[model samples]
Target: GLVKMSHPSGDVEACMVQVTCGSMTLNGLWLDNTVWCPRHVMCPADQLSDPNYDALLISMTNHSFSVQKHIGANLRVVGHAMQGTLLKLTVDVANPSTPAYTFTTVKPGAAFSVLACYNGRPTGTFTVVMRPNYTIKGSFLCGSAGSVGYTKEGSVINFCYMHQMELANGTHTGSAFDGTMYGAFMDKQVHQVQLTDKYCSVNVVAWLYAAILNGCAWFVKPNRTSVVSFNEWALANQFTEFVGTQSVDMLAVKTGVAIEQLLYAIQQLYTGFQGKQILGSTMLEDEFTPEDVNMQIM
Candidate 1:
């Protein structure tokens, strides 16, 4: 096998931006350009990049040459939208599979890090910056960030307006999160490395540090349900600080501490090959400011 390289065409491609064409799924759907869907694409760039926003419904009247229209939904289809939008489609299937794809369901455990498999343009950075919800889409970012998923711990879907795995296609992820989603997914991936059963990895230290910086800073112990209060956990674990269950984004806004500094602290979690990295820690308690979260639903 050859070593994989990064390129423009493979850039704007993330697992969260795939279009599910009925029984069959389409990967790397074009956002503003055709690198992803050069040969045969489903929708036109102009149609999706309209200035005056209309309905989310996509009329496939001409594409299908049928009486009915191919419709879809998206909030930020406007030309000015830099933040990627979610696309919900309802189109007619053409020349369907004989059995309409008996897709097998294979679920990884609570924590699984996936490749989301990138197979074009060496890397995936070409024109990705110009696309909507473009951050985590490409193979490079996807792998670099751990592309992990979590269990339904909370009804995180309600506020997930437009920041999911496939913000353009709405698959496997909700459309929102603090560094919460970021670290959460990576934490699960780290679990894959440490715990192999129904569990998840990319880099153990990277993901661990990432999880903390991304707002899983509390670092609770599952086996210690017998204890209550942050003091109890801290007393036993030997910790400091009083950050609560808030997203790092919100926390950054409240506290002067930037994410990079937190990452610096994360550096402490794994330094001297378990020496000073040994000194690093996460502290979770209730003694802080209430963040007036102005939800930026991009």
Candidate 2:
């Protein structure tokens, strides 16, 4: 639509096309047969990028990848940038001007959970450390004597509790994994296998193992059984050749976590221990405080 406006000191009136997004509106200039819109609005937070350019963020299902486990894809998207998922990792070298690499992942790769993390942050108060040298190999090292369950899935998910794992060559730089990593332990494994799941290896399993140490919760114990079973080599490669360039980290009953409170968590999951009913019914309050929300981000 045509919108009219005038300069403060000029006698001539100015008219331009009208552009709108959400509840916001502005006047746009005509270029050939098209009008240019704002460059921001990739989100409500897009105001931080730039103000001189024009763009639109429309309601869409997905752009490049999908990592859906938490929230729905509601009104927020653009030509590029701002996809909300992990493990939907995609890297394409098919055609590139720079000829290096371009991550097909919609959002940027670096974030707070990149390193040591459970499904969540250290927002809770519980800590534990454990090891599983033979259990990962399905060995009978610490085999408990009795009925092992109806199937391998039903059998014991054996693990070792410990102060810390020793160095491979024994004693390194006076530093160790330090008994156990300190973090909050939660009720379940909210962070599970992702898109690259087929690329799983003893390598990035560090992410899950770290997830264990950090007290992030898993929904089930059986889901993690195969991980600690047979192991592999050249991790990130298994992940890369296995998918892309990789990170090489060694293992020695390292990275992966244990199974004690794990038992408690599983029981709770089995018992249907879950969220509670709310009593504070609000008659009117629908503020979108982006800060009040985030994700489990595996």
Largest lDDT belongs to which candidate?
1
Q: What lDDT does each candidate get?
A: 0.25, 0.21
The segments of candidate 2 whose C-alpha lies over 4 angstroms from its true place after superposition are 1-96, 101-208, 215-252, 255-298
Per residue, candidate 2 scores C-alpha lDDT tens digits across 28-103 of 2112222222222222334433332223333422242211111111111222322211011122211111111112
Candidate 1 lDDT, 1-298, residue by residue in tens: 0112222211222222333222222332222211111111233434433322223224322222111111221111111111222232222332121111111211111121122322221122211111111122233333122122211113211111122233223223322222233212221111111111110111122233344444554432222221134334334332332233344355445444444444334333323333222214332111111211212211
Candidate 1 residue 252 Cα shift, in angstroms, is 33
TM-score of each: 0.24, 0.15
